[PDB]
Design an enzyme around this catalytic site. Sequence first.
Site, PDB file in Angstrom:
ATOM      1  N   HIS A  14       9.156   3.538   8.314  1.00 60.29           N
ATOM      2  CA  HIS A  14       9.217   2.061   8.156  1.00 60.29           C
ATOM      3  C   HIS A  14      10.380   1.300   8.791  1.00 60.29           C
ATOM      4  CE1 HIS A  14       5.581  -0.298   6.548  1.00 60.29           C
ATOM      5  NE2 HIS A  14       5.378   0.265   7.740  1.00 60.29           N
ATOM      6  N   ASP A 107      15.822  -4.418   4.925  1.00 60.76           N
ATOM      7  CA  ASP A 107      14.610  -3.954   4.217  1.00 60.76           C
ATOM      8  C   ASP A 107      14.848  -4.200   2.727  1.00 60.76           C
ATOM      9  OD1 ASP A 107      12.600  -3.522   6.072  1.00 60.76           O
ATOM     10  OD2 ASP A 107      12.609  -1.285   5.984  1.00 60.76           O
TER      11      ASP A 107
HETATM   12  O1  LIG Z   1      -3.239   9.074  15.039  1.00 57.22           O
HETATM   13  C1  LIG Z   1      -2.541   8.109  14.746  1.00 57.22           C
HETATM   14  C2  LIG Z   1      -2.098   7.762  13.433  1.00 57.22           C
HETATM   15  C3  LIG Z   1      -1.339   6.675  13.262  1.00 57.22           C
HETATM   16  N1  LIG Z   1      -0.974   5.859  14.299  1.00 57.22           N
HETATM   17  C4  LIG Z   1      -0.120   4.687  14.071  1.00 57.22           C
HETATM   18  O2  LIG Z   1       1.043   5.102  13.395  1.00 57.22           O
HETATM   19  C5  LIG Z   1       1.381   4.185  12.327  1.00 57.22           C
HETATM   20  C6  LIG Z   1       1.361   4.923  11.015  1.00 57.22           C
HETATM   21  O3  LIG Z   1      -0.012   5.107  10.628  1.00 57.22           O
HETATM   22  P1  LIG Z   1      -0.380   5.891   9.297  1.00 57.22           P
HETATM   23  O4  LIG Z   1       0.778   6.687   8.824  1.00 57.22           O
HETATM   24  O5  LIG Z   1      -1.652   6.620   9.516  1.00 57.22           O
HETATM   25  O6  LIG Z   1      -0.629   4.653   8.309  1.00 57.22           O
HETATM   26  P2  LIG Z   1       0.191   3.451   7.655  1.00 57.22           P
HETATM   27  O7  LIG Z   1      -0.720   2.351   7.314  1.00 57.22           O
HETATM   28  O8  LIG Z   1       1.431   3.181   8.412  1.00 57.22           O
HETATM   29  O9  LIG Z   1       0.634   4.104   6.306  1.00 57.22           O
HETATM   30  C7  LIG Z   1       1.968   4.396   6.140  1.00 57.22           C
HETATM   31  O10 LIG Z   1       2.545   3.446   5.274  1.00 57.22           O
HETATM   32  C8  LIG Z   1       1.785   3.312   4.080  1.00 57.22           C
HETATM   33  C9  LIG Z   1       2.319   2.140   3.311  1.00 57.22           C
HETATM   34  O11 LIG Z   1       1.256   1.441   2.731  1.00 57.22           O
HETATM   35  C10 LIG Z   1       1.854   4.610   3.337  1.00 57.22           C
HETATM   36  O12 LIG Z   1       1.102   4.431   2.159  1.00 57.22           O
HETATM   37  C11 LIG Z   1       1.293   5.726   4.204  1.00 57.22           C
HETATM   38  O13 LIG Z   1       1.517   7.012   3.631  1.00 57.22           O
HETATM   39  C12 LIG Z   1       1.975   5.758   5.534  1.00 57.22           C
HETATM   40  O14 LIG Z   1       1.272   6.654   6.393  1.00 57.22           O
HETATM   41  C13 LIG Z   1       0.386   3.024  12.442  1.00 57.22           C
HETATM   42  O15 LIG Z   1       0.977   1.911  13.093  1.00 57.22           O
HETATM   43  C14 LIG Z   1      -0.791   3.622  13.218  1.00 57.22           C
HETATM   44  O16 LIG Z   1      -1.290   2.746  14.193  1.00 57.22           O
HETATM   45  C15 LIG Z   1      -1.357   6.134  15.599  1.00 57.22           C
HETATM   46  O17 LIG Z   1      -1.046   5.446  16.552  1.00 57.22           O
HETATM   47  N2  LIG Z   1      -2.119   7.258  15.743  1.00 57.22           N
END
Ligand SMILES: O=c1ccn([C@@H]2O[C@H](COP(=O)(O)OP(=O)(O)O[C@H]3O[C@H](CO)[C@@H](O)[C@H](O)[C@H]3O)[C@@H](O)[C@H]2O)c(=O)[nH]1
Length: 444
Positions: A14, A107
């Site tokens: 984050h 944050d």
């Molecule tokens: O194959 C992938 C997977 C993810 N992403 C990017 O990486 C970031 C992180 O994605 P992901 O971790 O899958 O989801 P988030 O919505 O960021 O969720 C994060 O933040 C959330 C807060 O709501 C937590 O609950 C989750 O565990 C945590 O993964 C995002 O911007 C996605 O676009 C990619 O580009 N490719």
Amino acid sequence: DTHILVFPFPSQGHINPLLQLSKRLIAKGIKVSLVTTLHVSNHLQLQGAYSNSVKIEVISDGSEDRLETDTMRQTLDRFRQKMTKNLEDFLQKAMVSSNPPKFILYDSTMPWVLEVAKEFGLDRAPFYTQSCALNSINYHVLHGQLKLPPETPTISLPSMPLLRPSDLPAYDFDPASTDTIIDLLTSQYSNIQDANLLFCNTFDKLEGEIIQWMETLGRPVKTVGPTVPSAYLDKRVENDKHYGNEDVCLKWLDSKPSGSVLYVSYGSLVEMGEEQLKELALGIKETGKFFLWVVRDTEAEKLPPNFVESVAEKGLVVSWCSQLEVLAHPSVGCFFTHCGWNSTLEALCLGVPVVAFPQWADQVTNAKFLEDVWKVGKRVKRNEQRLASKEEVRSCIWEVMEGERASEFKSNSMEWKKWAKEAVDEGGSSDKNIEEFVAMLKQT
Ligand SMILES: O=c1ccn([C@@H]2O[C@H](COP(=O)(O)OP(=O)(O)O[C@H]3O[C@H](CO)[C@@H](O)[C@H](O)[C@H]3O)[C@@H](O)[C@H]2O)c(=O)[nH]1
């Protein structure tokens, strides 16, 4: 020259929202210094080549780092004590310099930053990177109108949709850390009376009434979201195509009919059981739809033995894709997502309906909104043992992509895509709040 300090929580995950916002106001003429740790520095791309590139300010030596022996509380205590001192030493130098920072944007998970800014008389604001809905929940848990174990079968907070206990954030994955996590989240709202502003990673059309409720706490609330790269929305900030590779996903998608493919991602940090991962894999296969599933190596090993082989025709199972590039591909008609706030906003910005399968934390509340409030998809029915059957997976996918409300979901998805873009485009609710902040910063 006007410059501020941006101090996100130093964890790979984050810091992106704050960096995305930094790009918006570097484009509006504000210089930005990223305050961060030694650790983040090493894993982050080194300082940019331009005059207005984000300036990296390492203020720690690494001794703040969590130890393997630590409890979460111990990690948080050492982090707070050391980073307090580090910020103090940094501002001691920066505040008496020729061009001192005019603001610190930090944050919300680090409220102790406000007390340090107060000492130096430095203008400050927390940044709430999750939904405004979570702000209401965490605030009401802080003030005692909501308990850690919900005291009733329906929760009716002011200006909020009705919530079942299953809709509330579940941080009991690690019961040892549950108390510490609840304390951290509630402490985000304790000292806001001394915050210049409260910034929120959302937009007015998505959580308008919840935002209006938050404005009654006595401080100016600035909605500045979604923090998804401009290239996927208003396309006004030079580059800004990713956060902070050779792709095959895009070519495979090119051969598929428009809106036919299910993009599957249950999160890049979520671990899943062999049992549930077997039902999910088989459930996706039973739909008979083209699907692109991104799952990391350690997770991909827990798949059923011949699963990948068996879906050679319809299924593309890969280690990594550009989630933004896949969601923006016109062959993608639906997104099986764990409903993380970043994934949630990405689905809404790119106008893609969802099959919601939340796992932990705010994902449960994000799923509730996606299904019942924004109405862009459905939540997979869980079991009495919290296990989703392959039949529950298959029916939920079919209902979203082919069911009675399939057309409703896409229509609502296209509306949110329009409104998200409008919010960050010139004159939008988010663009206005960002212009206001910039104008305020140029007043000193
Ligand atoms: O194959 C992938 C997977 C993810 N992403 C990017 O990486 C970031 C992180 O994605 P992901 O971790 O899958 O989801 P988030 O919505 O960021 O969720 C994060 O933040 C959330 C807060 O709501 C937590 O609950 C989750 O565990 C945590 O993964 C995002 O911007 C996605 O676009 C990619 O580009 N490719």
